Amino acid sequence: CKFKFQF
Amino acid sequence: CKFKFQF
Amino acid sequence: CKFKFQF
Amino acid sequence: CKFKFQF
Amino acid sequence: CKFKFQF
Amino acid sequence: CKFKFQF
Amino acid sequence: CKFKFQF
Amino acid sequence: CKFKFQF
Amino acid sequence: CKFKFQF
Amino acid sequence: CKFKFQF
Amino acid sequence: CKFKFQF
Amino acid sequence: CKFKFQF
Amino acid sequence: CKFKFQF
Amino acid sequence: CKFKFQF
Amino acid sequence: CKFKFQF
Amino acid sequence: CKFKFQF
Amino acid sequence: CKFKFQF
Amino acid sequence: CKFKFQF
Amino acid sequence: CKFKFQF
Amino acid sequence: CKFKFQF
Amino acid sequence: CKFKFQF
Amino acid sequence: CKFKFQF
Amino acid sequence: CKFKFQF
Amino acid sequence: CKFKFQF
Numbered sequence: 001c002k003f004k005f006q007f
Numbered sequence: 008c009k010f011k012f013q014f
Numbered sequence: 015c016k017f018k019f020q021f
Numbered sequence: 022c023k024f025k026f027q028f
Numbered sequence: 029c030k031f032k033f034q035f
Numbered sequence: 036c037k038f039k040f041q042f
Numbered sequence: 043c044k045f046k047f048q049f
Numbered sequence: 050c051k052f053k054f055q056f
Numbered sequence: 057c058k059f060k061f062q063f
Numbered sequence: 064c065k066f067k068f069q070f
Numbered sequence: 071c072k073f074k075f076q077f
Numbered sequence: 078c079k080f081k082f083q084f
Numbered sequence: 085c086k087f088k089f090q091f
Numbered sequence: 092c093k094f095k096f097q098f
Numbered sequence: 099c100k101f102k103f104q105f
Numbered sequence: 106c107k108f109k110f111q112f
Numbered sequence: 113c114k115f116k117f118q119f
Numbered sequence: 120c121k122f123k124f125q126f
Numbered sequence: 127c128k129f130k131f132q133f
Numbered sequence: 134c135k136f137k138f139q140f
Numbered sequence: 141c142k143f144k145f146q147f
Numbered sequence: 148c149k150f151k152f153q154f
Numbered sequence: 155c156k157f158k159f160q161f
Numbered sequence: 162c163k164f165k166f167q168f
Contacts, residue, residue: 003010003017017024034041034062041048041062041069048055048069048076055076055083061068068075075082089096090118090125096103097125097132103110104132104139111139118125125132132139143150150157157164 001008001015005012005019007014007021015022019026021028029036029039032039032062034060036043036046039046039062039069041060041067043050043053046053046069046076048067053076053083055074055081057064057067059066063070064071064074066073070077071078071081073080077084085092085095087094088118088125090116090123091098092099092102094101095125095132097123097130098105099106099109101108102139104130104137105112109139111137113120113123116123120127120130123130127134127137130137141148145152147154148155152159154161155162159166161168
């Protein structure tokens with residue numbers, strides 16, 4: 001919801 | 008919802 | 015929910 | 022929920 | 029540097 | 036450096 | 043360095 | 050270095 | 057905090 | 064905190 | 071903390 | 078803590 | 085020099 | 092030098 | 099030098 | 106040198 | 113602090 | 120601190 | 127601390 | 134500490 | 141001539 | 148001539 | 155001539 | 162000439 005960081 | 012950062 | 019970091 | 026780091 | 033985000 | 040996030 | 047996250 | 054996370 | 061410097 | 068420096 | 075330096 | 082240095 | 089900070 | 096910090 | 103910190 | 110820290 | 117001289 | 124001289 | 131001289 | 138000289 | 145500091 | 152510091 | 159520090 | 166420190 002707040003922060004979604006995908007690599 | 009707030010921040011979505013995708014790499 | 016807060017932070018999701020996937021490598 | 023908070024931090025999910027997968028390698 | 030490329031991205032500099034300060035919250 | 037490429038990404039610099041400061042919370 | 044590539045990612046620098048400071049919480 | 051590649052990832053530097055400081056909590 | 058008192059100081060947040062993103063160089 | 065008192066100081067947060069992201070160099 | 072008093073100091074958080076991410077070099 | 079008093080010092081957290083991530084070099 | 086590049087930076088002179090007298091705190 | 093690059094940095095001179097007198098705390 | 100690169101860094102001179104007088105704490 | 107690269108670092109001179111006088112604590 | 114009492115005296116702060118920056119040259 | 121009492122005297123802080125930065126040259 | 128009493129005297130802090132940085133040259 | 135009483136005197137801190139950094140050259 | 142330039143600076144005279146006496147304690 | 149330049150700086151005279153006496154304690 | 156330059157710096158004279160006497161204790 | 163440069164620095165004279167006497168204790």
